[PDB]
UniProtKB/Swiss-Prot annotation:
Protein name: RNA polymerase II elongation factor ELL2
Domain of life: Eukaryota
Complex formation: Component of the super elongation complex (SEC), at least composed of EAF1, EAF2, CDK9, MLLT3/AF9, AFF (AFF1 or AFF4), the P-TEFb complex and ELL (ELL, ELL2 or ELL3). Component of the little elongation complex (LEC), at least composed of ELL (ELL, ELL2 or ELL3), ZC3H8, ICE1 and ICE2. Interacts with AFF4; the interaction is direct and leads to stabilize ELL2 and prevent ELL2 ubiquitination. Interacts with EAF1 and EAF2.
Residues of the full protein shown: 200 to 292 of 640
Job description of the protein: Elongation factor component of the super elongation complex (SEC), a complex required to increase the catalytic rate of RNA polymerase II transcription by suppressing transient pausing by the polymerase at multiple sites along the DNA. Component of the little elongation complex (LEC), a complex required to regulate small nuclear RNA (snRNA) gene transcription by RNA polymerase II and III.
Location of this chain's protein in the cell: Nucleus
Family: Belongs to the ELL/occludin family.
PTM field: Ubiquitinated by SIAH1, leading to its degradation by the proteasome. Interaction with AFF4 stabilizes ELL2 and prevents ELL2 ubiquitination.
Amino acid sequence: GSSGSSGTISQRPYRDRVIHLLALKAYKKPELLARLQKDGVNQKDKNSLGAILQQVANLNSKDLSYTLKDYVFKELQRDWPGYSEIDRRSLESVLSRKLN
């Protein structure tokens, strides 16, 4: 039985941080960042992002917006520190709509 620990977002893998955002809704290469960058986005990752968005999300030429895949929803984390009192309840839906 541990007491506590330092759970920071940075310690988490970029991918997760990304999908966790695209989950609630689709985000644009630049936009999505504006959300992560805030907490701190690694330069070496800034480039990888584009690749991840396609590995976990899908870009729609329509509105050049990236859409979080379906299966990925399972990879997400219901205990993500990125989901506010609302987000959390706003995400539990999708997963429920996707994850049969």
